Design a protein around this nucleic acid. Structure first.
Ligand SMILES: [Mg+2]
Lengths: 4, 52, 631, 69, 48, 1196
RNA sequence: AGGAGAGGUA
DNA sequence: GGGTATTCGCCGTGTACCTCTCCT
DNA sequence: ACGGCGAATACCC
């Protein structure tokens, strides 16, 4: 759910 | 990971593995030391005491 | 030899190993160099032999370390001994942390919404395989077959006396169900099976956000616990009724989600001048009987008489009485509330947040089974009243504002003036960027604002009643319910899609001034495929990044277990509010809840409130905020 | 999960792990007593829930008596 | 149940030579670039 | 708009505003126009040399070693295949034709090199060279009885590519890529010193390679900065051969320098055509990039100047006078199709042939040396067969329906030999470049690890003669759009402004606007209209063929169109086909441009019809001098690659006047020549009871009885009769000790009867092989004396049906022992088969000349030697050729697998209805699993009593912004109403002047397309009107479709509200719902993800050999993998007893499994978990290295 | 029985 | 002698499931 | 292909  | 880099050193140092762990205890198929694997040891320490 | 086997093949062949190839390549150089040594052959070739005997053994132990690619028949390098124990496909992984198992099956999952939270639907065809020795014993027990061969025989003919034995055998015998990536421990839960007919598995609608499942194709595996210590471990620890809250937070995981939220949101709204407004009821039976007659609305304000007990924070139990001002729909939910909870919980509009709050309170104040009964009942009521509502979606729900065309034309005239500046060389990067993109980014949100002043408001003017009322639009009620949908997703259906991104990240100067309702052109639909492909490409080239991190974390922290009640220490950390340097962004409360104290918490005047060693809970963290403490 | 609650037993035992250990000892002693094979195929319950229920009723056994050394 | 292979020439164990570090190029204190010449027949060493 | 045979039995109303400029080119012409260049010659397209012969022509003169021998290629011809495409997959052959080449020898008196081969031995002849598989008429290959497709390939085009690799500054590269050869590349550094490199050697300085002329003084003359000066005072080599031996020290580790081996290498790495080639594209792309044409147009090797210029341009690009290259531009990527690949493998194998001939040209010593015992043909057949059998771009064909095939033949992979990997690549070869517009579809790709690397072809796109995709545009000359189509390549259109198809023109083809959205560098722009140069020809020019089948696509979200396109390639075809009522006008094109519909080749009129053939009577006055009779044969219940069913049905009636191109039969999932993957359902968008909760679907059970989604599935089993060592395997029915009841459904031979209903576990074929040496244990010795068991010298390798399955046998095929006199049974069966099959060929032939003579005695009764005295002797040869081959087998139509005697096949067919668990979908990206089949009196119903078909949750629609799914249901209500407006009139005064008047308001009231029914006669109005009773079909193109004013007008005419919404009634009580629901006619599919082939439970099966765990995969008996992430979860619960048995007693505690099973069956309790047998395996192979791992007791 | 290549599902 | 400053090699890169042909 | 880490060696403090 979090990459950028 | 890094299985050879680990096994060569372990064999030169003639290391010993006290099983003692979660993962170490699933490779040889016995109760992990957690959860119900602790409590059966605990609740069984009470029986040899009561038979004495 | 039985570990490098020589199984035959189809038609007079042998699918031999690579451990026999590399053993032969060593014996055939050992013998050669031996009888070369016997003859006193020259040293210039005996050395060439010795160098060849060495490389053969280095390949037997592992090829690729020094040699190039010592290779077999199918131009594929041979597999050594140091490859049968290493890497993702070695022995440790794939065989010792692995282990395919018996008493196991699979199928597709369907929805089955008449189940209780502790139940699953299991086909007869699967459940007859999985429970087959149990059935053999129960046949040969109750005098149907004498030796296990006749029982084995009547199980394959699928007699009639077999399908009720199977119903009694799987009665109170649980099973575990698992989904594809088990991302946390809620991905395995135990259930109680009930034989259905068909070939899919029925999954209770509330255990789906745990598993991360939906019903557009997913499958699931079923395992059967065999021993009484594993059958008890299935009920006491894994059974789905115990897994009410997340282990990563305290929040609930059985909160109604999509069209249970819409029914409960619908019936608890209220309409001002409605049919039956102001009546006086004295029970839930009253409002029910009067509603089932078609003479009273479900959004009509009424007055109801309540008389119930309500536990509060300290644990005391006062008495709630009187005549409250309600809606017909809220008072129809009063039947499922248990004793302990106040009717102020239901007496509101019941967006998703408030339903989760109801389940929170039911768990904290009443416990476990009270909550898993309240959740089932909320499920049934939402499922029922979203149906009876006949709620749908058409194309006129997507209402396009009336100012859109003028907004966009003014943005265009401003763009033309910016390039008018640029043609006389008065600006270089702004007069073709960061200015046009700001014009379009501002107009995008003005039009997204105009679009909610049209899907949210309404109008009635009946009795000189000309004023704005909250709409019952079906697209709006789906978002404001928190059931499904955002403001940007709704902004693209009926506003304008605005600016898009080339994959590097910069903004394409020409904005999509059209939404999905009027339809995109082809030069506008093209520029929105870059972002779509970039997103889809990120999505699959990223689960490897996160799965690697998870596996590392589980290997660093695996053997940490809670093994004693107290260690006697008196040291810790100073907790505060995690401000940004501008504002709080998280309170000290909600950061100190559940954490025990290492030092006393003396106040600024001098007196202490809490000694060291107190497990902080919700009934002790108000003292931290009411008495001005901040570290 | 019909009529034996784990919350009913967590008023007598600890840790939810002790419950499993003790219930399994009780169930093993029930099963190593007969409990079937003669006249009560579809007339009884499973030793798992029979053992789990005697803890929730302060019935035939309590944690201290569950031993039978 | 295993058996064995009576080699007539001694041969080093590749692991104790190329596992980085080398437990063989470290006992003697000679760089592996020089142990690999003596072990694959391209130079000499004075044992004494 | 009637205008065809089948296009006027049911006319489709078309919407849209844009004209017709260019019709969709033939779809498969990327597979068929490339195997034509390989094998044939065409002087119209300037191909004077087929490419099979440019390979021979360039390599043949061998001239072994001064031996008065020199071979010369003269000519070739390709043979005729043994069988036809239809018989190969029947028998198991590959559809190939032999190649024979003409080769002439020369000799003389073996003199002191006085023309040693000029005088005598001038022999010449035709010699067999190899087999070449032929491409069938559609574009597939039968390779061992298996249809295949050879996917295209997108690779890097030869030439010089100046990269940058921007990590530091000043780093600039320059690679020269060959078609085949070595990679000469250079580079720079922020220090400023030009280096070099060959294929993957270490970096050695750049002036080393420069020594081809050396001459340190004559370098700087033609070379002005300190860059080579930092290299020319970096080159220690002075002489040529010194630098050569230096470079040789890089081409060989451990070698000594020679004097004629070192110079040969360099002079033959970039200058020998047999080892290095630029291949006609490297040469022209080089001459373009470097600009000059100093080198010829046919020099495919590295001239010396093509390195000096590369060095010069590398330093100039480093100094700012030039631009670097774009690696993902479709100007720098070329397409290589199947003809080019097979030509490469032909060159590979032919080099070995010509290197073996001259070798054994000497070692053959005899008289009268004919050129037949010196050339071998095995290394050509064996390389082409390797490409086709084991290649990676030569794949199983996707059948499953017509669209799967059409869309698999149009696919362009970037992987494969000479391309990327699914792992090495990342994040920029997977991206929609600006030059994909018009050339590759930017919507259709896989959804796994292949995304961005498979990339099917666009609609109007063309691979040109060099391999670069192209797309057509309309010239805008003098500001006025003209009608001269022109194909432009990505490099070409880089300098043009290109409008779109839907810009507004005004009666003179000028633009009405003054600022439009164009594409000015592939990039979008808002520019004046006076700047425009081109304009598209269509609006589906951008999208693929499977995405142009989706109506209302400009109202959908690309993420969902992507999966709506991908899911109608998995749709199972149904029992009875059914058009879409809302379509795009492309189902006809996709069903026609595949070879499933039968097409008439000549104007004629139907003479005979049944469900096996059609006989047309050619009207020869308007057609060519054809056979006077066309016979079309029909495919009936044929198995597909996905086990589905292919079947053709005739459309025509005896007496019908047909034309050239008209459809005479429908095939694989087609209905009057339109593609029909699913059915039209009456859908209500509302939640029902949690039965459409997440994405589930609720069905009507009026649908299972109507047999809507039922499909036929044909499964083929095989039994072989081997020739095993210890005894031959016979297929005689004498099954030892088999129950006599199970001996009923089998004929006197031992095979089942065609037409029997077999269940799971029955004998299909009875084969017996021997078996001796029983030696049963003492248990059988103590209880075998009570019945006196007999001894068996034979075993039963008798085929049985698998588990779960059933069906009826529809076909049995036998191929008996090759080259062996069969007994009174097998030879008799083969003789009866010959007598029956030649007879059927007789009756097929006795009717062709029957119609021919009926026509010959037609124009003469009312010299007769012109067209009558030729036909009868032609068909006799036909029955002659078909008659022997129909029995001219190898007694098994093949070698019959040496070691095997007889191979028999059996076909079983079964019907499968939809059920809870099966996956359904619509064309708009919405899928879901069927949860319940409701009775019909529980479904919501309309006011007049009509129930509903499906209920679909409305929540899924606004979150996933696919609105075309709603507009489709509105336009389906409209058409359902229009089609009941006709059924009302048909039951009251069924004249043909009334029907002609309701059709006018159904058709010509909304829109500007005007069906023009004044061209059908009253017998045609009566069948048109009787086909429009389910709904008037409507066609809405893909970016030029119906508006909303139009759907509202049609909804009015149908008598509905101008929203899709109406009052429904609770089927369970009868009172309405509040809030009008949206009802309509969505078109829904059924995908090949049935729950019948997914269930699989297992209790105890059979285990592996090495590790002794259960097997896995549902095909043996499976067992599910309790992985490691599934062990972390049991650890996080604290479930120690659950985790200890899922690791020992359930999988590989060999001694524990047996005891657990024996305990459960007896009702006991005991558990010892000794140690998993896969830890003994690991400690036994860690000591197979030199290490000692062991257990211990720790006393200290 | 095992392995390769190719495709697909979640 | 001491200390960087490239240079080159080694180890790593998510889970479960289905189908086909081809080789041994 | 990419990254990060570690032993190796050559070029200046
Ligand atoms: Mg899913």
């Amino acid at each position: 759910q979090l990459t950028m | 990971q890094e299985t050879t880099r680990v096994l060569t050193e372990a064999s030169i140092n003639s290391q010993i593995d006290n099983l003692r762990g979660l993962k170490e205890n699933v490779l040889i198929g016995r109760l992990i030391p957690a959860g119900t694997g602790l409590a059966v040891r605990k609740e069984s320490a009470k029986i040899e005491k009561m038979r004495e | 030899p039985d570990l490098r086997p020589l199984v035959p093949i189809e038609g007079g062949r042998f699918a031999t190993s690579d451990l026999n190839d590399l053993y032969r390549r060593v014996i055939n150089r050992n013998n050669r160099l031996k009888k070369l040594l016997d003859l006193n052959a020259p040293d210039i070739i005996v050395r060439n032999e010795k160098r060849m005997l060495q490389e053969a053994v280095d390949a037997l132990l592992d090829n690729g370390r020094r040699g190039r690619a010592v290779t077999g028949s199918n131009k594929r390098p041979l597999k050594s001994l140091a490859d049968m124990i290493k890497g993702k496909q070695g022995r440790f992984r794939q065989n010792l942390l692995g282990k395919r198992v018996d008493y196991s099956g699979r199928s597709v999952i369907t929805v089955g919404p008449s189940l209780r939270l502790h139940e699953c639907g299991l086909p007869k065809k699967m459940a007859l395989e999985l429970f087959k020795p149990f059935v053999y014993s129960k046949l040969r027990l109750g005098g149907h077959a004498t030796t296990i061969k006749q029982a084995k025989r009547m199980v394959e003919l699928e007699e009639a006396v077999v399908w009720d034995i199977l119903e009694t055998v799987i009665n109170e015998h649980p099973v575990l169900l698992n989904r594809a990536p088990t991302l946390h421990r809620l991905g395995i839960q135990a259930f109680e099976p009930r034989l259905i007919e068909g070939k899919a598995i029925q999954l209770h609608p509330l255990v789906c956000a745990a598993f991360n499942a939906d019903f557009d194709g997913d499958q699931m595996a079923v395992h059967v616990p065999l021993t009484v210590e594993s059958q008890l471990e299935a009920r006491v620890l894994m059974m789905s009724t115990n897994n009410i809250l997340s282990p990563a937070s305290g929040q609930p995981i059985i909160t109604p989600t999509q069209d249970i939220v819409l029914g409960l949101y619908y019936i608890t709204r209220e309409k001002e001048g409605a049919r039956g407004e102001g009546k006086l009821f004295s029970s839930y039976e009253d409002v029910s009987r009067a509603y089932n007659s078609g003479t009273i609305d479900i959004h009509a304000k009424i007055k109801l008489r309540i008389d119930r007990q309500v536990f509060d924070t300290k644990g005391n139990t006062y008495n709630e009485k009187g005549v409250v001002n309600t809606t017909v729909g809220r008072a129809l939910l009063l039947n499922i509330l248990p004793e302990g909870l106040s009717f102020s919980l239901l007496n509101k509009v019941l967006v998703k947040k408030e339903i989760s709050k109801i389940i929170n309170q039911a768990f904290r104040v009443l416990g476990g089974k009270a909550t898993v009964v309240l959740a089932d009942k909320l499920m049934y009521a939402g499922f029922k009243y979203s149906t009876l509502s006949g709620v749908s979606v058409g194309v006129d729900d997507m209402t396009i504002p009336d100012n859109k065309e003028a907004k966009i034309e003014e943005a265009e005239k401003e763009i033309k003036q910016i390039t008018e500046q640029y043609q006389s060389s008065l600006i270089t990067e702004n007069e073709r960027y960061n200015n046009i993109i700001n014009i379009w980014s501002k107009t995008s949100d003005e039009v997204g604002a105009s679009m909610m002043d049209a899907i949210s408001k309404d109008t009635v003017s009946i009795n000189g009643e000309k004023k704005e009322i909250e709409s019952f639009n079906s697209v709006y009620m789906m978002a404001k319910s928190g059931a499904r949908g955002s403001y940007n997703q709704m902004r693209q259906l009926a506003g304008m899609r605005g600016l898009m991104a080339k994959p590097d990240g910069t903004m394409i100067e020409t904005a999509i001034t059209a939404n999905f309702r009027e339809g995109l052109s082809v030069l506008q639909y093209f520029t929105s495929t870059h972002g779509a492909r970039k997103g889809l490409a990120d999505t699959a080239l990223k689960t490897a990044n996160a799965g690697y991190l998870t596996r590392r974390l589980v290997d660093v922290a695996q053997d940490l277990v809670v093994i004693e009640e107290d260690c006697g220490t008196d040291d810790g950390l100073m907790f505060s509010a995690i401000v940004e340097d501008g504002e709080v962004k998280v309170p000290l409360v909600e950061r100190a809840l559940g954490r025990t104290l290492a030092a006393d918490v003396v106040t600024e005047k001098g007196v202490v409130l809490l000694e060291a060693g107190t497990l902080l809970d919700e009934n002790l963290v108000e003292l931290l905020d009411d008495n001005g403490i901040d570290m | 999960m019909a009529r034996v609650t784990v919350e009913d037993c967590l008023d007598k035992v600890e840790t939810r792990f002790d419950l499993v250990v003790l219930a399994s000892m009780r169930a093993n002693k029930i099963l190593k007593n007969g409990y079937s094979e003669s006249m009560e195929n579809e007339k009884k319950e499973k030793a798992t829930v029979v053992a789990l229920r005697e803890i929730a009723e302060s019935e035939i056994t309590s944690e201290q008596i569950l031993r039978n050394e | 149940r295993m058996g064995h292979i009576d080699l007539v020439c001694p041969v080093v164990h590749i692991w104790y030579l190329k596992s980085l570090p080398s437990r063989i190029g470290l006992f003697l204190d000679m760089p592996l670039k020089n142990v690999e010449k003596v072990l694959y027949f391209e130079s000499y060493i004075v044992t004494d | 708009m009637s205008y065809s045979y089948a296009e006027k039995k049911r006319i489709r109303k078309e919407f849209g505003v844009l004209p017709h400029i260019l019709d969709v080119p033939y779809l498969l012409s990327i597979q068929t126009e490339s195997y034509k260049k390989f094998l044939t010659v065409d002087a119209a397209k300037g191909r004077l040399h087929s490419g099979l012969e440019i390979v021979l022509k360039q390599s043949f003169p061998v001239e072994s070693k001064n031996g008065q021998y020199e071979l010369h290629y003269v000519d070739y011809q390709i043979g005729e295949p043994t069988f036809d495409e239809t018989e190969c997959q029947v028998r198991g052959a590959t559809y190939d034709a032999p190649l024979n080449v003409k080769l002439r020898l020369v000799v003389y008196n073996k003199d002191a090199l006085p023309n040693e081969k000029i005088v005598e031995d001038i022999r010449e002849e035709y010699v067999y060279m190899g087999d070449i598989p032929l491409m069938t008429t559609n574009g597939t290959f039968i390779i061992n009885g298996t249809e295949r497709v050879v996917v295209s390939q997108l690779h890097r085009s030869p030439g010089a590519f100046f990269s940058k690799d921007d990590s530091e500054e000043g780093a600039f590269s320059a690679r020269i890529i060959p078609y085949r050869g070595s990679w000469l590349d250079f580079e720079f550094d922020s220090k400023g010193i030009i280096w070099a490199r060959i294929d993957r050697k270490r970096k050695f300085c750049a002036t080393v390679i420069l020594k081809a002329l050396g001459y340190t003084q004559e370098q700087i003359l033609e070379n002005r900065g300190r860059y080579i000066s930092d290299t020319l005072k970096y080159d220690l080599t002075r002489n040529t051969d010194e630098a050569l031996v230096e470079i040789y020290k890089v081409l060989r580790p451990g070698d000594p320098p020679a004097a004629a081996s070192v110079k040969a290498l360099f002079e033959g790495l970039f200058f020998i055509e047999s080892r290095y080639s630029l291949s006609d594209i490297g040469r022209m792309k080089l001459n373009a990039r470097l600009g000059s044409d100093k080198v010829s147009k046919d020099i495919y090797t590295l001239e010396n100047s093509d390195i000096v210029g590369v060095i010069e341009e590398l330093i100039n690009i480093r100094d700012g006078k030039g631009k670097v290259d774009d690696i993902d531009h479709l100007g720098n990527r070329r397409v290589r199709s199947v003809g080019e690949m097979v030509e490469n493998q032909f060159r590979i194998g032919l080099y070995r042939v010509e290197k073996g001939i001259r070798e054994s040209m000497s070692l053959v010593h005899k008289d009268k040396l004919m050129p037949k015992d010196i050339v071998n043909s095995k290394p050509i057949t064996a390389a082409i067969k390797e490409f086709f059998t084991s290649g990676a771009l030569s794949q199983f064909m996707d059948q499953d329906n017509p669209l799967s095939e059409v869309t698999h033949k149009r696919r362009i992979s970037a992987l494969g030999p000479g391309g990327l990997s699914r792992d090495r690549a990342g994040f920029e070869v997977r991206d929609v470049h600006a030059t994909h517009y018009g050339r590759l579809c930017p919507i259709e790709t896989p959804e796994g690890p292949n995304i961005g690397l498979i990339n099917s072809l666009a609609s109007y796109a063309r691979v040109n003669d060099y391999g670069f995709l192209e797309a057509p545009y309309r010239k805008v000359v003098d500001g006025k759009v003209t009608d001269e189509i022109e194909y432009l390549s990505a490099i070409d259109e880089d300098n043009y402004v290109i409008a779109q198809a839907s810009t507004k023109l005004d009666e003179n083809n000028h633009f009405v606007e003054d600022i439009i959205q164009c594409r000015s560098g592939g990039e979008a722009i808002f520019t004046e209209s006076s700047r425009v140069q081109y304009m598209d020809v269509s609006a589906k020019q951008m999208v693929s063929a499977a995405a142009a089948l989706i109506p209302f696509l400009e109202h959908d979200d690309a993420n969902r169109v992507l999966m709506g396109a991908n899911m109608q390639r998995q749709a199972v075809p149904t029992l009875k086909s059914e058009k879409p009522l809302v379509g795009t006008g492309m189902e006809k094109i996709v069903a026609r441009d595949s070879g499933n519909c039968i097409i008439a080749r000549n104007v004629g009129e139907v003479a005979e019809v049944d469900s096996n053939r059609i006989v047309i009577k050619v009207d020869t006055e308007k057609s060519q001098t054809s056979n006077l009779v066309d016979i079309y044969s029909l495919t009936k219940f044929k198995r597909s690659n996905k086990n589905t069913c292919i079947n053709q049905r005739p459309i025509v009636n005896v007496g019908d006047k047909v034309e050239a191109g008209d459809i005479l039969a429908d095939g694989f999932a087609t209905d009057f020549g339109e593609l029909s993957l699913g059915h039209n359902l009456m859908v209500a968008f509302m939640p029902w009871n949690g039965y459409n909760f997440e994405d589930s679907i609720l069905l009507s059970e009026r649908i299972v009885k109507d047999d809507k989604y039922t499909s036929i599935h044909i499964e083929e089993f095989t039994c072989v009769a081997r020739d095993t060592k210890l005894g031959p395997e016979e297929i005689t029915a004498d099954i030892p000790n088999v129950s006599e009841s199970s001996l009923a459904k089998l004929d006197e031979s031992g095979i089942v009867h065609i037409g029997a209903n077999v269940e799971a576990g029955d004998i299909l074929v009875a084969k017996i092989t021997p078996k001796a040496e029983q030696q049963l244990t003492p248990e059988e010795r103590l209880l075998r004396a009570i019945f006196n068991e007999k001894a068996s010298n034979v075993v039963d390798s008798s085929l049985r049906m698998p588990s779960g399955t059933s069906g009826t046998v529809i076909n049995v095929q036998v191929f008996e022992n090759d080259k062996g006199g069969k007994s009174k049974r097998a030879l008799k069966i083969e003789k009866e088969l010959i007598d029956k099959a030649r007879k059927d060929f007789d009756e097929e032939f006795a009717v062709i000349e029957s119609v021919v003579k009926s026509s010959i005695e037609q124009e003469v009764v009312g010299e007769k030697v012109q067209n009558a005295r030729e036909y009868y002797e032609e068909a006799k040869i036909a029955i002659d050729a078909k008659f022997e081959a129909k029995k001219k087998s190898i007694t098994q139509s093949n070698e019959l697998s040496p070691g095997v005697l007889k191979t028999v096949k059996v076909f079983v067919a079964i019907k499968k209805r939809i059920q809870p668990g099966d996956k359904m979908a619509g064309r708009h990206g919405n899928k879901g699993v069927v949860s319940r089949v409701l009775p019909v009196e529980d479904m919501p119903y309309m006011e007049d009593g009509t129930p509903v078909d499906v209920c679909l949750n409305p929540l899924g629609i606004p979150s996933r912004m696919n609105i075309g799914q709603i507009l489709e249901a509105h336009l389906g209500l409209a058409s359902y109403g229009l089609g009941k407006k006709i059924e009302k009139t048909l039951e009251k005064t069924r004249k043909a002047a009334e029907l002609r008047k309701t059709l006018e308001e159904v058709y010509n009231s909304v829109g500007d397309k005007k069906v023009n029914l004044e061209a059908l006669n009253d017998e045609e109005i009566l069948t048109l009107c009787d086909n429009l009773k389910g709904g008037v079909p409507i066609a809405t193109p893909v970016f030029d479709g119906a508006k909303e004013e139009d759907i509202k007008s049609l909804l009015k005419i149908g008598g509905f509200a101008t929203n899709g919404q109406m009052k429904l009634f609770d089927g369970r009580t009868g009172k309405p719902f509040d809030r009008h629901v949206t009802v309509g006619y969505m078109y829904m599919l059924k995908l090949d993800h049935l729950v019948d082939d997914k269930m699989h439970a297992r209790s105890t099966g059979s285990y592996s050999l090495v590790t002794q765990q259960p097997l896995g995969g549902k095909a043996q008996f499976g067992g599910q993998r309790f992985g490691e992430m599934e062990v972390w979860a049991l650890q996080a619960y604290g479930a120690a007893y659950t985790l200890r048995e899922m690791l020992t007693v359930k999988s590989d505690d060999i001694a524990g499994r047996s005891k657990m099973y024996k305990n459960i069956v007896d009702g006991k309790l005991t558990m010892n978990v000794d140690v998993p047998e896969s830890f003994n395996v690991l400690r036994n192979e860690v000591r197979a290295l030199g290490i000692d791992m062991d257990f211990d007791y720790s006393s200290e």
